[PDB]
């Protein structure tokens, strides 16, 4: 072998360390895997790298950069400038931290361990939430926040599971012990949100630090955190919808090793990282990798080398770091923030540590992991180990070690003392000009814009509707959103193909036929006729093909900005069961559990049209089952004007409560399902609606002996059958607001039909679905003088939302109408 | 006189009119500085004759005077004293 | 020296990033997509060979920058990188004329089928494969390569696009069945199918099947894996087999926007190498038409490729030009070879286009004018491939005419057939004998020689032998008695879930770990062997799952579909986390039989009960499962005794009916000393859908003294019974409904008739008034049994927006209030 | 008079008598030997009998006609020969 052959192997060796050195790094503080770890004469031979270096010197730089307490994964990144940035900061001789910095890390380890000792000594059942063996996450998190403050950023928003939460609250968020342990019994405090101010120890800046609320459902909060941060960024005019590119609100997402690899919402949330409608300018992820998930070993938890491998999905750099090295942990945390600031992309920190105690109380973890726990039993605490390492290296004197010990005792006294002291003692109507302005906006096209020939009639029809009436559902929605933007409200609308609309009805964004340029007619309403801004905005997006992460994000966004109108639209309501964890754990229940309020709107296209069991139902029955007084508003409007007033009421009521709307599909193009101008200018939301022959016509309510109560599009088919047979003995009353039940309005309406001898709840849905399961039980109870004897007319009970046959659908639909008028 | 310029209690004033004025996390301190970055016994403000002196009494994070670490220092009007994350200005 | 360093770095640059420059897009939408000249004739040493720079560049550009983009240097295993490198960095032999004509025959059938579908029926545009027809010769090449390895079956999962095309041209189903009474569209877009594939050029046949699926994109991914795993365990191949062939292959199809956005994709990839879930590698095909309805890829994903999630498990990724059917078939064969060599997932990203709009009347130029102006210039895949063969002189004009006649005949074959088509519960004993109980008890102490039991586990083993011979059988042992007796009778039992080997509440110990070596011992596996040494045919497959609910529940549903004779149980850590698998519950478990005729016997074990641990550690949402139920879809139960749970599982496993079972299981009731069963309950009884208090059935209690009846289910029974005993309340009786669905109407009526002096009836439950069994029972009981349940009142927690309060003190106050009201 | 037995294909075991001058084999539903598969062209092959001699002729199929795994335009058949038409394998017997 010649110098030419020797060179080729040296360049291949340099590449091998850059690509795979992380597989040999000393990252495990337990050293469980023993098997984990050119000739000798070539060591003093020089090689071109435009430097010249001896092979021993090349090896020394490579082993220090890639094979000590930090394992770097970055050659998978497709952007070469990002690879070079990491390479330059990792392949250099590092300046040892100053004694003041080392003592500061020790002070944080003192506070972390003193807090855990307090928690495990004072209370029962705290073992499951213990941070013992992972305490280095406290100086790590502190280094993340300090680095964000160093960049002069505005806020760090944290999301995390239970492990170390109270520790984080005290030692990171800075909440007093008297508030954390107030009436402490695990506790609800493990789930609550918090805010505080972080002050740099060595720098000139302060930064807000907050923590979002979350359920026990590991990782479900990940997309909620992203939406909350985006909402705050939009308010601060930073990031994607901001005049600056600082993304000055930082998501800091904490995870566990087994949950990060197994929960699909992790991948869904990473997939939002660079999207125009969802990007937050990069998240800082910290995985508390204690190499166990309750009793489960990593080999049964994941199919890859690392728990963090999913982050390779978006080309994020990954830093595997030894939790027994708090200096390497703090350094990795600062580098992660710097990378996030430089490239506005996610960084993942895999902190390798251990779980000192059993997962629960009384649990002896040597039952299922005897080898791991025999090794853990030999481990000294992170604080004692770091104190001893500082003495050994001569970084601190024995007098300073004694100072550190007295500091630790004082940290212990401080928390016991404080807890000891605590235990002792409006119209939604708009004027004609407003309707006309929104209509005219659809034709106020930019100079030289080419409308698609199939889109142009929609624009012209909207101006026609705004001035002359017969307003359809899709325009009534834009009238609601547009009038809110003109009144200074931020409106955020998103979902799958939501810009155009699944049923080609919305056209919130129109595309130039020759250039592809976009035009948003409702954005013109963000400017008053005189040219001044209203303060309003239209943020409309096509989401990713997600339900869990997308619904989570919109819930999060509404929490981050309570003054925003936030709407998420399902392609068909049948796909919202993909976001069941957000509905159950956040939307329907967050106010009662955490005092956390949300005004998020869910739009669920619903209706029996013979398109099958996945294109028929938004499961009204599930949302009604989840409901309890004051938790959500649930509606199925039958008219475009009533939908318009429902959205405007929701946006202007000053109440933060989720709204669930079962929206139409074929009823979008039903010519009978149109509204008059008067319905927008001189009316309000109608929780209960009567037939126009009684309110506007000459119909006689006294002739009615059979009352049909219903909701949604089946109203029009019932009304048509009544008109066909000239059935004056039958009346159809619509319940527009399904929850809260409009008890008073419903009673006052039914009293206007004195000769009614029988009442029926009519619905398209199977008997075990729709509004019947809750209404059949609740109506005779809350209105016994009106609804005792109430009977049901519906499709038979089914294990699916509908039949899979359109012919069977049509036969069943006719059977309901025939029974209603039989 | 000492005024807190940085810390959760920013704007709080403390009179130095005794031979020894303790500053630390101990709840019995003359200047109670409640933060994890402040040791139970951190510093003392000593008055001898006409001069005021700051003394570090074995804290973990040290005591700084005008952004420099000190064991003991004679204080002069306008000096900034750092005790943990707290920043105090000494005034005459 | 500086030149060699550049050449070696250039070789690495093509291997790592050549795929970014490859000609993979048939539309060429992105125009911007695409050492000196004297160095081209200089020789350099390469891995040991000597080659000119121009020759190195030529091999690299042919391997990495033509119609195939290879992604493999991310793979951590160097032998896997070398294997790909050797097959990709070689001069390839052009396909023979017979092979090219075979690909053309498959393109003929694909396009003829699409023409038929778009011409005969309305509303077929949304499911069109036009612009992606090359997926048919690609899939055919995958299956043919699997048959070449002598494998047993390929099982396909896919969404709607091209499904009927796949049914006809891949599965081999006749047109008279595919188009029978033809109308998400027709139900046939969702149904399962089986067929036999015969190699055109080789000696083998291979079974080809297609699993059923809902419209929920990607939800079927973990169902496919479970089904494949169950079939592999049956054929004694794979993880739980005597051979390592994994002779049943998952073929998973996807769309570009769904593959990147649906979390179940990552959850399913995460199972790929797990001992309890691995299927020896899935072949993935992404039909990447660079659009998702009206959405552009930039709003769909945060990465260069839709396939980047597969990097999670170090899978090789092949981006291939859909306008090159030879490159597509070659990539398909290489993917099968890699899967066979390393038993790992391979992803094929097939770049193509969507010729038509995603819906009828929908002009896609409204939202994508530029893409559709380019698509309008594109010639069909078949015409393009036919013309290319003529141009290159691979086929004569006479053979092109042969191919055209063949195409016309493929068209006539489908039109003619459709025109002609248009013209035209076992209830045997679940009781076991004493010897059976004793054998399962003794198995817990029949430890391997030298096995060191953990000191806290040893009393559990000894208590089980004690219970087997003497009684007071607890819940955890009764479960293992059920599973053990089924294994002894020759049944395969698969049990899994989070920490299911030991049990969340440290109660199961299905697997015990040697204190000194970490070696595992499974006491119930000893029941797979008869006393005489012969096998029973039974097996115990028990695993700790990944921290997933969606993929894990999907897999277990899939497994039961794949092996209907298996006992398949999935256990939730707490029933409160099963809402993570809501799409499987709604789209498969509760509804698959009525929608597709697809049967499943999967068991869901949901730990449930109000104990003051908060809203995420209290409820398996009984009310949601009762709301989903309709006659014959599922069995829903909340047993109160260990023997009744034992009989419920044995009835479920022995009835010869494939129907899911939902069990609301206990937590603190596991250690309730009153919640124990006698030996006679296992040996002389059966499952009891309705249970009375033992003082009336076995004691001297007088039913005629009862004026107030308390109807309930689950653990609250014991608190009600203890309050009755404390106050000697002879005027009150407690009846348990053990089987919540189907409602045991006749047994409940016969039981209530035994209390003639009852003046009032109450449904008592722990759950909030809008949860538990009250919303369905409050409505159904007065209607199905009006002479018994008219006037039925509710005693429960108040209605709540969450399953419980977050305070244990509030819980305790509410629990006492229910008991006080029940006996007030 | 001769016989064709299907050895591979969905109709394996099926027998066809060759006792007329021309016997058509293809996907056309009117074929004398209807071979229903996408790999078989509408008009694929013909079995032509003349003076006790049986001949297989490819009549312009896409996937060709094989006799003893060798592609042919036309071939004189002999007892035991394997004929391949698409995925179908037939044995010719006397
Ligand atoms: C979505 C979800 N599924 C299941 C659980 C039950 N659970 C609680 S802790 C745990 C293991 C967590 O492992 P890991 O993510 O490594 O975190 P660690 O406890 O080790 O910090 C599980 C399965 C949960 N809380 N959330
Ligand atoms: C889980 C789920 N969410 C939403 C939909 C609605 N949907 C039907 S087609 C479509 C887009 C599919 O895009 P892609 O995956 O690229 O497949 P393509 O139609 O392009 O083949 C969507 C959102 C669905 N069927 N499933
Ligand atoms: Ca509101
Ligand atoms: Ca069964
Ligand atoms: Mg863990
Ligand atoms: Mg697509």
UniProtKB/Swiss-Prot annotation, chain A:
UniProt superkingdom: Bacteria
Gene Ontology MF annotations: 2-hydroxy-3-oxoadipate synthase activity; 2-oxoglutarate decarboxylase activity; dihydrolipoyllysine-residue succinyltransferase activity; magnesium ion binding; oxoglutarate dehydrogenase (succinyl-transferring) activity; thiamine pyrophosphate binding
Chain sites annotated for binding acetyl-CoA: 633, 649, 684, 687, 737, 744-745
Catalytic activity: glyoxylate + 2-oxoglutarate + H(+) = 2-hydroxy-3-oxoadipate + CO2; 2-oxoglutarate + H(+) = succinate semialdehyde + CO2; N(6)-[(R)-lipoyl]-L-lysyl-[protein] + 2-oxoglutarate + H(+) = N(6)-[(R)-S(8)-succinyldihydrolipoyl]-L-lysyl-[protein] + CO2; N(6)-[(R)-dihydrolipoyl]-L-lysyl-[protein] + succinyl-CoA = N(6)-[(R)-S(8)-succinyldihydrolipoyl]-L-lysyl-[protein] + CoA
Stated name of the protein: Multifunctional 2-oxoglutarate metabolism enzyme
Assigned protein family: Belongs to the 2-oxoacid dehydrogenase family. Kgd subfamily.
Any coiled-coil regions, as ranges: 395-425
Substitution effect: residue 629 to A: Loss of activation by acetyl-CoA
Entire protein: shown range: 361 to 1227 of 1227
Keyword entries, A-Z: Acyltransferase, Allosteric enzyme, Coiled coil, Decarboxylase, Lyase, Magnesium, Metal-binding, Multifunctional enzyme, Oxidoreductase, Thiamine pyrophosphate, Transferase, Tricarboxylic acid cycle
Documented EC number(s): 2.2.1.5, 4.1.1.71, 1.2.4.2, 2.3.1.61
Keyword 4Fe-4S part of the UniProt annotation: no
Function in brief: Shows three enzymatic activities that share a first common step, the attack of thiamine-PP on 2-oxoglutarate (alpha-ketoglutarate, KG), leading to the formation of an enamine-thiamine-PP intermediate upon decarboxylation. Thus, displays KGD activity, catalyzing the decarboxylation from five-carbon 2-oxoglutarate to four-carbon succinate semialdehyde (SSA).
Residues the entry annotates as binding thiamine diphosphate: 163, 216, 218, 257-259, 290
Signal peptide: none
UniProtKB/Swiss-Prot annotation, chain D:
Keyword Phosphoprotein set for record: yes
Residues annotated as signal peptide: none
UniProt KW keywords: Phosphoprotein
Protein origin, superkingdom: Bacteria
Keyword Phosphoprotein on entry: yes
Record domain FHA: where: 23-72
Function: Involved in regulation of glutamate metabolism. Acts as a phosphorylation-dependent molecular switch that modulates the activities of Kgd and Gdh.
The protein's assembly and partners: Monomer. Binds via its FHA domain to Kgd, Gdh, and the N-terminal region of PknG.
The protein's name: Glycogen accumulation regulator GarA
Taxonomic path: Bacteria, Bacillati, Actinomycetota, Actinomycetes, Mycobacteriales
Gene designation: garA
Shown residues in whole-protein numbering: 54 to 147 of 158
């Amino acid at each position: 072998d010649s110098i030419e052959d020797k060179n080729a192997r040296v360049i291949e060796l340099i590449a091998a360390y850059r690509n795979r050195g992380h597989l040999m790094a000393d990252i495990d503080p337990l050293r469980l895997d023993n098997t984990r770890f050119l000739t000798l004469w070539d060591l003093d031979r020089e090689f071109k790298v435009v430097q010249r270096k001896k092979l021993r010197d090349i090896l020394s730089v490579l082993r220090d950069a890639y094979c000590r307490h930090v394992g770097v994964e970055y050659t998978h990144i497709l952007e070469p400038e990002q690879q070079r940035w990491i390479q330059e900061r990792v392949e250099t001789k590092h300046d040892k931290p100053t004694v003041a910095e080392q003592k500061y890390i020790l002070s944080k380890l003192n506070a972390a361990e003193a807090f855990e000792t307090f928690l495990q000594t004072k209370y029962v059942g705290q073992k499951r939430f213990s941070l013992e063996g992972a305490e280095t996450v406290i100086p790590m998190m502190d280094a993340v926040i300090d680095q964000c403050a160093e960049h002069g950023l505005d806020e760090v928003v944290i999301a995390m599971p239970h492990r170390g939460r109270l520790n984080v609250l005290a030692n990171i968020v800075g909440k007093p012990y008297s508030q954390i342990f107030s009436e402490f019994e695990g506790d609800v405090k493990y789930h609550l949100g918090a805010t505080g101010t972080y002050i740099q120890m060595f720098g000139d800046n302060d930064i807000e630090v907050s923590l979002t609320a979350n359920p026990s459902h590991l990782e479900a909060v990940d997309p909620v955190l992203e939406g909350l941060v985006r909402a705050k960024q939009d308010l601060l005019d930073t990031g994607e919808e901001g005049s600056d590119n600082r993304f000055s609100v930082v998501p800091l997402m904490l995870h566990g090793d087994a949950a990060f690899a197994g929960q699909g919402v992790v991948a869904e949330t990473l997939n939002l990282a660079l999207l125009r409608g969802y990007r937050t300018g990069g998240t800082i992820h910290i995985v508390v990798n204690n190499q166990i998930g309750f009793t489960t070993a990593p080999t049964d938890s994941r199919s890859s080398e690392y728990c963090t491998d999913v982050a390779k999905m978006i080309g994020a750099p990954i830093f595997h770091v030894n939790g027994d090295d708090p200096e390497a942990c703090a350094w990795v945390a600062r580098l992660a923030v710097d990378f996030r600031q430089a490239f506005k992309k996610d960084v993942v920190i895999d902190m390798l540590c251990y779980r000192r105690r059993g997962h629960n109380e009384g649990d002896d973890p040597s039952m299922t992991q005897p080898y791991m726990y025999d090794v853990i039993d030999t481990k000294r605490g992170s604080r004692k180990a770091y104190t001893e390492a500082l003495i050994g290296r001569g970084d601190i004197s024995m007098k300073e070690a004694e100072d550190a010990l007295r500091d630790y005792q004082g940290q212990l006294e401080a928390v016991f003392n404080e807890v000891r002291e605590l235990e002792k003692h409006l119209a939604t109507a708009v004027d004609k000009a407003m309707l006309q302005r929104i209509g005219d906006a659809h034709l106020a096209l930019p100079e030289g814009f080419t409308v698609h020939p199939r889109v142009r009639p929609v624009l012209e029809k909207r101006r026609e509707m705004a001035y002359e009436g017969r307003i359809d559902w899709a325009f009534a929605e834009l009238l609601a959103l547009g009038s809110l933007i003109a009144e200074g409200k931020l409106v955020r609308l998103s979902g799958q193909d939501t810009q155009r609309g699944t049923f080609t009805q919305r056209h919130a964004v129109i595309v130039d036929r020759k250039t592809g340029e976009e035009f948003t007619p409702l954005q013109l309403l963000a400017t008053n006729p005189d040219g001044t801004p209203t303060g309003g905005k239209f943020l409309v997006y096509n989401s990713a093909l997600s339900e869990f992460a997308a619904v989570g994000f919109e819930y999060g966004y509404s929490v981050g900005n309570p003054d925003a109108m936030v709407l998420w639209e399902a392609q068909f309501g049948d796909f919202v069961n993909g976001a069941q964890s957000i509905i159950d754990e956040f939307i329907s229940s967050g106010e009662a559990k955490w005092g956390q309020l949300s005004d998020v709107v869910l739009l669920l296209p619903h209706g029996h049209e013979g398109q099958g069991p996945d294109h028929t139902s938004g499961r009204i029955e599930r949302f009604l089952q989840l409901w309890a007084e004051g938790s959500m508003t649930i509606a199925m409007p039958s008219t475009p004007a009533n939908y318009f007033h429902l959205l405007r009421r929701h946006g202007k009521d000053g109440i933060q409560r989720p709204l669930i709307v079962f929206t139409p599909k074929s009823m979008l193009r039903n010519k009978a399902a149109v509204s008059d101008i008067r319905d927008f200018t001189e009316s309000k939301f109608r929780s209960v609606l009567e037939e126009p022959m009684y309110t506007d016509g000459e119909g006689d309510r006294n002739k009615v002996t059979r009352l049909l109560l219903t909701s949604g599009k089946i109203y029009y088919e019932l009304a048509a059958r009544k008109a066909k047979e000239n059935r004056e003995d039958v009346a159809i009353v619509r319940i527009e607001q399904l929850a809260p039940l409009p008890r008073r309005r419903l009673a006052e309406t039914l009293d206007r039909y004195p000769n009614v001898k029988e009442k029926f709840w009519v619905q398209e849905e199977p008997a075990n679905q729709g509004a019947w399961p809750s209404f059949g039980l609740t109506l005779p109870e809350i209105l016994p003088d009106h609804f005792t004897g109430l009977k049901r007319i519906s499709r038979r009970a089914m294990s699916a939302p509908s039949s899979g046959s359109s012919k069977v659908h049509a036969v069943e639909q006719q059977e309901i109408l025939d029974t209603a008028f039989g | 006189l000492l005024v807190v310029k940085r810390g959760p209690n920013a704007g709080s004033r403390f009179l130095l009119d005794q031979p020894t004025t303790s500053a630390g996390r101990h709840p019995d301190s003359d200047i109670f500085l409640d933060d994890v970055t402040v040791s139970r016994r951190h510093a003392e403000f000593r008055l001898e004759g006409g001069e005021f002196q700051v003394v570090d009494v074995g804290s973990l994070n040290g005591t700084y005077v005008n952004r420099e670490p000190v064991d003991s220092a004679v204080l002069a009007n306008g000096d900034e004293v750092q005790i943990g994350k707290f920043r105090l200005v000494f005034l005459t």
